[PDB]
């Protein structure tokens, strides 16, 4: 296990780390979210950049990042543009996506970025090396908002993210059945049994999938998303409820 340390937080041992997603259409609403969010307890702040309207301006995006870092100087910060094809709020060109992600890395404002595996091998491997050259960690991610791939497919996808240099492979899948939820947990456990080189984030989305967000210490998901007031993805529960369950499981 190559654990990831960001500001005294160790991702990939002990209790799963709680992530909450900040969503703001503009700099003023990003600022008000950050002030409200630093009154909640969690391990990692994700800025969902795709919710930001003025995405065309690299500098406006960096101004918004700065307002979040100013509000919370010592939170581990994850810069995440979620593309619409993986369930995000808007479309941008690959080129603009890598520009924003490189801008974020160079800013020194963020500790981690999200790179979607399906961006394409050469673009991901180059952005990963770029992140790593500036000591920014990569959460390499895949989302399927429609169905749950087989356990084999999710294990090979997560190992693929490892091979392209992901610090923290991440997969989030929509169950169609309770069976699909088990499949995801099986996939998670298979990485813990057989492929435990990098911590991995797994989740089965929606109401049926919620157990996947609670059980990460047993089956080996290194982090889980709670909601401060709005959920960034369906099946997230209130961040205090999530912390309660995590602590009862760790201390059992
Ligand atoms: C990845 C996963 C999400 C989830 O299913 O909880 C939320 C999204 O903001 C993250 O980027
Ligand atoms: Na994704
Ligand atoms: Na999808």
Numbering used by the authors: 1 to 252
Please quote the paper that reports this structure.
Several studies have identified the enzyme type I dehydroquinase (DHQ1, 3-dehydroquinate dehydratase, EC 4.2.1.10) as a promising target for anti-virulence drug development. An essential histidine residue (H133/H143 in Sa-DHQ1 and St-DHQ1, respectively), is also involved in the formation/hydrolysis of the Schiff base intermediates.
Herein we report the synthesis of compounds 6–7 in which enhancement of the electrophilicity of an endocyclic carbon atom in the ligand towards covalent modification is attempted by direct introduction of the amino functionality into the quinate scaffold. These compounds are substrate analogs in which the carbonyl group at C3 has been replaced by a hydroxyamino and an amino group with R configuration (compounds 6 and 7, respectively). Compound 6 was found to be a time-dependent irreversible inhibitor of the two enzymes with K I values of 90 ± 8 and 130 ± 12 µM and k inact values of 8 ± 1 and 13 ± 1 ms−1 against Sa-DHQ1 and St-DHQ1, respectively. The two adducts Sa-DHQ1/6 and St-DHQ1/6 crystallized as dimers with two molecules in the asymmetric unit (namely chains A and B) and were solved at a resolution of 1.65 and 1.90 Å, respectively. Unbiased, calculated electron-density maps showed clear electron density for the ligand covalently bonded to the catalytic lysine residue (K160/K170 in Sa-DHQ1 and St-DHQ1, respectively) via an amine, which is visible in the two chains. Dehydration involving the C1–C2 bond took place to give a shikimate-like core, perhaps after covalent linkage at the C3 position in 6 via a similar mechanism to that observed for the natural substrate. Thus, compound 6 provides non-labile enzyme adducts by avoiding the intrinsic Schiff base hydrolysis performed by the enzyme. For the St-DHQ1/6 enzyme adduct, a long hydrogen bond between the C5 hydroxyl group and the side chain of residue S21, which is located on the flexible substrate-covering loop, is also identified.
